[PDB]
Design a protein around this nucleic acid. Structure first.
Lengths: 151, 189
DNA sequence: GGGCTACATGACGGCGAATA
DNA sequence: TATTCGCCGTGTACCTCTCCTAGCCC
RNA sequence: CGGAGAGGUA
C-alpha cells in the first residue's frame, strides 16, 4: 500500500453522515450546525474562554466581526476540520460519562432519557474500545495497490 | 418569578461521588448589583467559575453553604442527605428569603414557600449563583483531600467513580471520607 | 532545455429520526 | 403522538449488437 | 479481461 500526506485535516464523510451522525451526537451538536462549520461558511470557538464566548458557539461572519472588536487574546476560535479535531482532542471521556450517567436517573423526561442513554452507550463502547476521538478526523490518506486498480 | 423581593436560589453538587460530602449553596442576589455571565457552572471554565466566587460572595445580598457528611449520607441515603444539606444552606442565610427556588424537581421541608425548577441553574440567576458556589467549594475540598491522600487522585476526578478512582479504591481500600454506602465502596470494604 | 489546469420530475411502500 | 422528508431497496441465469476522459510559453 | 446503452430467451 501507500499513503498521502495531507496539509490540512479532513473529516470522514462516513462518520459525518452515518445517520445518526456519530460525531454530531458525540459532541452533542446538531447536524445542521456541525455541517456548516466544516465548509468555512461560519465560525466556531475552539475551547475559548471569554466573558460571553464559552466552549462551543457557532458565530457567523458578522458575529465574529463584533467579537473581534476589543478583545481577542485568550479565547480562540478556529474554523473547519482543525477546530473540530482540536475539540475532539480536548474533550474528556471518563468525566463526561460520569456526568451523563447521573443526569440519567434524576432526569424525568422521556425523550431526553432516550437521547441521554443513546449518548452514554456510545461513550462507554468507545471507552472500552481502543480508539481515540481524534482518529475520526482523517489526516493521512492510504492509496489502493495499483494492481487492484489496473490501467 | 414569584411576586416577592427576597428570592433565594439553591443548587447541589456531589451527588454521584464516592468520597466527601454532598454540598449545597443558597444565594439571594442583589437586584441593584447584577452579576453578568451567570450560567450552568459546568459550561464555565475553572478560571471564570472561580472568578465568580469573588463577585458572587461580594455582590449577593446573602449566601450560605450547607453540607451533609459521608456518615449522614450513609444513614439517610443520598436523596435525604441532599435535602438536609439544602436545608442547612437555606438555614444559614443571614437574610431570610421570602421564597426559595431549588434546582431539580423536589423541595426540602422549609419554613418558607419553595418551588423546584428543572434545570434552574440554566434559567434562574440565583440557582446559577448557588451552582457556582457549591461547585467551587466542593472542587477545593477534593483538591485539599488530594494533598492528604495523593494515591487516589481526588483533585482530578473530584471523587466520581472513574476507572482510575475504582482501581485506587481496590488497591488502597476506602478512607474515612469514602461514602460507605455506595456500591463500589461496599465492595472495597 | 524546464515545468505544468481540473442536468430531473407519473414512486409503488414503510421506518426513523428530524420537526410540527 | 402524527406529519414530513430522508434513504433503504426493489429475483436469477444466459445470448446478440454498438460505444467510451485532453489541456498552458522564455 | 473494465464500464454504459439497446434488444432477446427461459
Amino acid at each position: 500500500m501507500g499513503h498521502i500526506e495531507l496539509a490540512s485535516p479532513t473529516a470522514h464523510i462516513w462518520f459525518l453522515k452515518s445517520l445518526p451522525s456519530r460525531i454530531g451526537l458525540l459532541l452533542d451538536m446538531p447536524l445542521r450546525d456541525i455541517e456548516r462549520v466544516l465548509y468555512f461558511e461560519s465560525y466556531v470557538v475552539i475551547e475559548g474562554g471569554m466573558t460571553n464566548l464559552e466552549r462551543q458557539q457557532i458565530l457567523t461572519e458578522e458575529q465574529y466581526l463584533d467579537a473581534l472588536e476589543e478583545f481577542g487574546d485568550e479565547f480562540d476560535a478556529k474554523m473547519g476540520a482543525e477546530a473540530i479535531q482540536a475539540l475532539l482532542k480536548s474533550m474528556d471521556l471518563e468525566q463526561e460519562c460520569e456526568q451523563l450517567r447521573e443526569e440519567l436517573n434524576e432526569t424525568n423526561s422521556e425523550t431526553k432519557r432516550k437521547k441521554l442513554t443513546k449518548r452514554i452507550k456510545l461513550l462507554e463502547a468507545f471507552v472500552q474500545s481502543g480508539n481515540k476521538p481524534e482518529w475520526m478526523i482523517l489526516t493521512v490518506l492510504p492509496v489502493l495497490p495499483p494492481d487492484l486498480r489496473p490501467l | 418569578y414569584p411576586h416577592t423581593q427576597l428570592v433565594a436560589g439553591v443548587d447541589e453538587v456531589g451527588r454521584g461521588p464516592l468520597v466527601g460530602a454532598v454540598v449545597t449553596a443558597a444565594v439571594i442576589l442583589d437586584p441593584a448589583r447584577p452579576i453578568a455571565g451567570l450560567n450552568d457552572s459546568k459550561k464555565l471554565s475553572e478560571k471564570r467559575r472561580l472568578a465568580l466566587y469573588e463577585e458572587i460572595k461580594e455582590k449577593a445580598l446573602s449566601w450560605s453553604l450547607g453540607r451533609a457528611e459521608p456518615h449522614e449520607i450513609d444513614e439517610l441515603n443520598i436523596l435525604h442527605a441532599t435535602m438536609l444539606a439544602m436545608q442547612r444552606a437555606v438555614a444559614g442565610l443571614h437574610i431570610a428569603p421570602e421564597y426559595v427556588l431549588i434546582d431539580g424537581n423536589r423541595c426540602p421541608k422549609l419554613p418558607m414557600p419553595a418551588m423546584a425548577v428543572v434545570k434552574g441553574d440554566s434559567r434562574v440567576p440565583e440557582i446559577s449563583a448557588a451552582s457556582i458556589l457549591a461547585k467551587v467549594t466542593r472542587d477545593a475540598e477534593m483538591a485539599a483531600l488530594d494533598i492528604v491522600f495523593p494515591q487516589y487522585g481526588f483533585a482530578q476526578h473530584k471523587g466520581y467513580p472513574t476507572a482510575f478512582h475504582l482501581e485506587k479504591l481496590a488497591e488502597h481500600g476506602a478512607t474515612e471520607h469514602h461514602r460507605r454506602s455506595f456500591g463500589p465502596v461496599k465492595r472495597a470494604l
